[PDB]
Amino acid sequence: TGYDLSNSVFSPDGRNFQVEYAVKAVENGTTSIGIKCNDGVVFAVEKLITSKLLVPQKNVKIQVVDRHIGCVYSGLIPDGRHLVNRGREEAASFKKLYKTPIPIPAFADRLGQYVQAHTLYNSVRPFGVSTIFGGVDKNGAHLYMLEPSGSYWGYKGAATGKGRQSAKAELEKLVDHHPEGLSAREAVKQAAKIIYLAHEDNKEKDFELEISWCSLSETNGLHKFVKGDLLQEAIDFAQKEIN
Amino acid sequence: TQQPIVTGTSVISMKYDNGVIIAADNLGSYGSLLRFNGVERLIPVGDNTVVGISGDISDMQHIERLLKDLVTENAYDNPLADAEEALEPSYIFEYLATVMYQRRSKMNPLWNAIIVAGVQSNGDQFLRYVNLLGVTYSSPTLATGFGAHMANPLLRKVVDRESDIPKTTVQVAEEAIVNAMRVLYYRDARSSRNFSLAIIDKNTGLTFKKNLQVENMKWDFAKDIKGYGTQKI
């Protein structure tokens, strides 16, 4: 034993226990989801209201990369911010050299290689976040989810955090009941519902809903936050479904 | 140190009662060769600022990319990016002025003369100049290159000092700018007939006019001019 004390060490299984321990930090975090729709993607996150003293709608969790990519994560919030800062540098250098905005699969690998690099040495700690991200590019809509190991895949729907099982079950129903696809405005409504349903795992404290979206028709392929009437409409739809 | 290759000529501008006007022709010259006839030298930043650039075009395109990147960067982690924490003309100018002076200090300048025209949050008119040396100044009228010598005299007859700004309407100001552009076409050998004009008003916002032409030109008197002194035929 002692294989779990240092990062980048293979156990006799062939496992990197330090990465597996980073996953535990992710599982401890709040629920965040992603939904791939017809011409774009929708991101939503659970924000736990620890106290009345928290200013509503101010502590924003979802982050934009470039102008077409949205990023959300669960786990250690600072680690996610560090990863997004790198993502922004990667996207800037891509656009600087190649002119065109970074494609989503290209962007996914940039984050993937960076996270994977933090499993290669004992002088660094793995990332304590699972990041759900995506957007619209020349080839259409893309949704990704990236783990502490550096492992990522493309997704129809994605979920992580403490209420991931509940969320995953809900996402699986949407995939089955909508093979032809889901619209952007529908996805926002469904995203709100899933976060509310996933809140049963964090039912002690009340929460605040935060949604964003990229859509070719609704937002011209740019990342925008869901605000005002459209946000309230999604909350009302979500509250109606739980009752 | 370098030399400018593909170049843009005058950028002219002035303040009026509710905002600012800025203009520049659509030419990219290659020495005496009038090489490129479709070059846009007025670059808007948001809905409250227009940056007019003269001089080296390769450096202009670099500056254009910096401003484009500046908007992207300002939007990061900024819920008020399209409101209270939007980019101001003063912010955009000071950034450029910092870069210009830094580059001249490394003996590797951006070979340009720049005028940042816009309207601030409080409605105040913004108009300031910066160039390859990092020299900056503000005035009710500003012009680069040949515009400094020919446009300013005409524009200063409309707004001669600060107190003339509230007395100057947008129609009078635009008329003066358009006339100045005609005069430059008469007299600047590296100018073109085609130009762009931009108005930034505190009420009506940003109006960007493309594909304008110099018109109402006086040439008829040329027929009476014969020889260089004694020749009659």
From Swiss-Prot, chain A:
Shown chain mapped onto the complete sequence: 6 to 248 of 288
Organism: Saccharomyces cerevisiae (strain ATCC 204508 / S288c)
Note: Present with 12000 molecules/cell in log phase SD medium.
Entry's localization field: Cytoplasm; Nucleus
Gene Ontology process terms (BP): proteasomal ubiquitin-independent protein catabolic process; proteasome-mediated ubiquitin-dependent protein catabolic process
Post-translational modification, as annotated: The alpha and beta forms are probably products of the same gene with different post-translational modifications.
Highest taxon of source: Eukaryota
Complexes and interactors: The 26S proteasome consists of a 20S proteasome core and two 19S regulatory subunits. The 20S proteasome core is composed of 28 subunits that are arranged in four stacked rings, resulting in a barrel-shaped structure. The two end rings are each formed by seven alpha subunits, and the two central rings are each formed by seven beta subunits. The catalytic chamber with the active sites is on the inside of the barrel.
Recorded GO MF terms: mRNA binding
Name listed for the protein in its UniProt record: Probable proteasome subunit alpha type-7
Recorded family membership: Belongs to the peptidase T1A family.
Keyword Heme on entry: no
Function summary: The proteasome degrades poly-ubiquitinated proteins in the cytoplasm and in the nucleus. It is essential for the regulated turnover of proteins and for the removal of misfolded proteins. The proteasome is a multicatalytic proteinase complex that is characterized by its ability to cleave peptides with Arg, Phe, Tyr, Leu, and Glu adjacent to the leaving group at neutral or slightly basic pH. It has an ATP-dependent proteolytic activity.
Alphabetical keyword list: Acetylation, Cytoplasm, Nucleus, Proteasome
Any one annotated GO CC term: proteasome core complex, alpha-subunit complex
UniProt keyword Electron transport, yes or no: no
Swiss-Prot record, chain B:
Species per Swiss-Prot/TrEMBL record: Saccharomyces cerevisiae (strain ATCC 204508 / S288c)
Gene3D superfamilies for the chain: Glutamine Phosphoribosylpyrophosphate, subunit 1, domain 1
Cellular location(s): Cytoplasm; Nucleus
GO CC, any one term: cytosol
Summary of the function given for this chain in its UniProt record: Non-catalytic component of the proteasome which degrades poly-ubiquitinated proteins in the cytoplasm and in the nucleus. It is essential for the regulated turnover of proteins and for the removal of misfolded proteins. The proteasome is a multicatalytic proteinase complex that is characterized by its ability to cleave peptides with Arg, Phe, Tyr, Leu, and Glu adjacent to the leaving group at neutral or slightly basic pH. It has an ATP-dependent proteolytic activity. PRE3 and PRE4 are necessary for the peptidyl-glutamyl-peptide-hydrolyzing activity.
Quaternary assembly: The 26S proteasome consists of a 20S proteasome core and two 19S regulatory subunits. The 20S proteasome core is composed of 28 subunits that are arranged in four stacked rings, resulting in a barrel-shaped structure. The two end rings are each formed by seven alpha subunits, and the two central rings are each formed by seven beta subunits. The catalytic chamber with the active sites is on the inside of the barrel. Interacts with CIC1.
Name of the protein this chain belongs to: Proteasome subunit beta type-7
Record-stated family: Belongs to the peptidase T1B family.
InterPro entries xrefs: Ntn_hydrolases_N (IPR029055), Proteasome_beta4 (IPR016295), Proteasome_bsu_CS (IPR016050), Proteasome_sua/b (IPR001353), Proteasome_suB-type (IPR023333)
Pfam family, one: Proteasome
Note: Present with 16900 molecules/cell in log phase SD medium.
Keyword 4Fe-4S tagged: no
Underlying gene: PRE4
SUPFAM superfamilies xref list: N-terminal nucleophile aminohydrolases (Ntn hydrolases)
Keyword entries, A-Z: Cytoplasm, Nucleus, Proteasome
Source taxon at top rank: Eukaryota
Any single GO BP term: proteasome-mediated ubiquitin-dependent protein catabolic process
Location, primary (coarse class): cytoplasm
Keyword Nucleus: yes
